[PDB]
Design a protein around this ligand. Structure first.
Ligand SMILES: [Ca+2]
Length: 539
């Protein structure tokens, strides 16, 4: 499961250090709770963490936190020799409050900082991070092989020929606009450099915007593309869009893409960071492919298909440190139809879900690796929670296949009751789609594995659900947390290390009916039921 990625992560807590390990802790609002693996290494200015390089690499991304209000640098050594550049570390993009979200606490403590090494280290080499001028809590480091900067394709129109400033001083918005107009049906080239784009660009259609690689062609914008419609055939490729967003303003489109890329479009090879939402997509995006991107450090969702999406594929992306659902489909206005989230890797959404499907028709969630979620969500949520109107509830077949969910689920502070790793939630209406949950690996869940709930207390049925094939290991409470009326069939679910019981079956509200668990065969390790519905299984 997960994205096919040209990098390998090494947890700081698995490296050799003179600092202090923090965690594990799942408690909402703690520094350790937002760390990958629930653990990190605090480095005083004393102290270093020495990583053994896991693979050939020439680039480094580090997830870290520094105290709010402070900033500094983190030195890098390779084989005991100090590199001549350091990582910039700051709290500027961290420590986000969302008081309007009930139950949310201050969050978003970490950030990601990157550096080309100027060297190509190899497996067995040592990369050491040394704190010098600020206390740095290091979570995890990614070791990547980044290709050399690509050359300009023949016939493309360079933004610098239209007046763009690759030193990042002047505003390049008009130059990009002029290049797009001059390269209709063709390619706009973004040479290596830093480009300030106050933005937004609109009328982006019939054009490829291509950089030399997301480590070389860097756009600095907090409002890059914003348009309600487009003729489509837009291809965004191989550049970075890095904003300066430090808060979540729901009414402000402080996003990389806001609106419509039109039909037949694609987004690939991008590095998207320090925005509110990476891609807030509405309207016509038929057949859009969003693939092989990194979306890091966003104060809200990584990507949301907010209605009308048709045959959109989001695949092979890496998402870390989103401020809400990392990937979401919200079928307002018109159903998202035949869309798929496939083979993505998601870690540490600060609140809410790894993947959330709210309504929609014939949706696939396949092959994703989702780790370390927090209060207010699940690893995967398949949901009829509407939030607003006009909403289109789940319809057709929802295919949830081949996903791996690691340390997902959390106590919701609004109930003091937990959300499970994977939930089906008949929040505002009964499940009228078929929901097929197959070949799921659920590992080290702090609470329950599978949850079936009508989360608003309205008593709508969770039904038409089949769970077929699962490897469930080290579940804190129950394999099945059944709190909605309805029915589901379970086959081929193998559980080990279940903390409390196989099944908790206690539907609410009283008066809304029973939930029938059908044992379809092949199940093992969870053949017990929690005896007392008036109590809660504890981890
Ligand atoms: Ca960690």
């Amino acid at each position: 499961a997960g994205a096919d990625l040209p990098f390998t992560s090494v947890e700081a807590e698995s490296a050799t250090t003179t600092g202090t390990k923090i965690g594990p802790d799942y408690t909402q609002g703690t520094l350790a709770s937002e760390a990958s693996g629930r653990q990190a290494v605090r480095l005083d200015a004393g102290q270093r963490v020495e990583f053994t390089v896991p693979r050939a690499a020439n680039a480094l991304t580090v997830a870290y936190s520094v105290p709010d209000g402070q900033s500094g640098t983190l030195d890098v050594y390779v084989n005991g020799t100090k590199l001549d550049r350091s990582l910039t570390v700051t709290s500027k993009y961290s420590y986000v409050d969302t008081g309007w979200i009930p139950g949310a606490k201050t969050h978003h403590f970490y950030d990601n900082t990157r550096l080309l090494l100027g060297r190509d280290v190899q497996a067995g080499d040592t990369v050491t991070l040394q704190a010098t001028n600020v206390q740095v809590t290091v979570d995890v480091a990614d070791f990547e092989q980044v290709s050399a900067a690509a050359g300009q394709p023949a016939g493309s129109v360079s933004v610098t020929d239209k007046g763009a400033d690759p030193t990042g001083q002047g505003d390049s918005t008009q130059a990009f606009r002029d290049a797009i107009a001059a390269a209709q049906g063709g390619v706009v080239w973004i040479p290596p450099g830093d480009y300030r784009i106050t933005g937004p660009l609109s009328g982006v259609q019939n054009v490829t915007l291509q950089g030399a690689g997301s480590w070389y062609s860097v756009v600095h914008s907090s409002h890059f593309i914003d348009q309600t419609d487009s003729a489509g055939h837009v291809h965004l490729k191989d550049f970075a869009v890095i904003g300066e967003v430090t808060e979540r303003v729901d009414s402000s489109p402080d996003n990389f893409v806001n609106g419509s890329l039109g039909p037949g479009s694609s987004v690939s090879g991008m590095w998207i960071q320090h925005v509110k939402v990476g891609l807030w997509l509405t309207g016509t995006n038929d057949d859009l492919v969003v693939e092989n991107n990194r979306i890091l450090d966003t104060t809200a969702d990584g990507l949301n298909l907010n209605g009308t999406a048709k045959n959109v594929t989001v695949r092979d992306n890496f998402l870390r440190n989103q401020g809400d659902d990392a990937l979401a489909m919200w079928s307002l206005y018109a159903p998202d139809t035949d869309c798929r989230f496939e083979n993505n890797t998601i870690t540490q959404p600060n609140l809410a879900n790894g993947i959330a499907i709210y309504g929609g028709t014939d949706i696939t969630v396949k092959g994703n690796l989702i780790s370390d979620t927090n209060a207010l969500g699940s690893g995967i949520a398949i949901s009829n929670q509407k939030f607003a109107e006009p909403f289109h509830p789940l319809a057709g077949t929802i295919t949830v296949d081949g996903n791996t969910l690691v340390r997902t689920g959390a106590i919701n502070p609004n109930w003091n009751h937990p959300m499970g790793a994977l939930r089906v939630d008949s929040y505002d209406s009964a499940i009228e789609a078929r929901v097929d949950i197959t070949d799921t690996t659920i590992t080290d869940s702090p609470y329950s594995a599978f949850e079936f709930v009508s989360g608003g207390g309205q008593g709508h049925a969770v039904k038409n659900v089949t769970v077929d094939g699962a490897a469930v290991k080290n579940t804190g409470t129950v394999v099945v947390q059944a709190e909605a009326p309805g029915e589901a069939t379970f086959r081929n679910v193998t559980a080990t290390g279940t903390g409390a019981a196989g099944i908790y079956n206690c539907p609410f509200p009283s008066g809304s009916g029973t939930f029938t668990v059908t044992d379809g065969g092949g199940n093992s390790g969870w053949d017990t039921t929690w005896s007392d519905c008036s109590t809660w299984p504890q981890p």
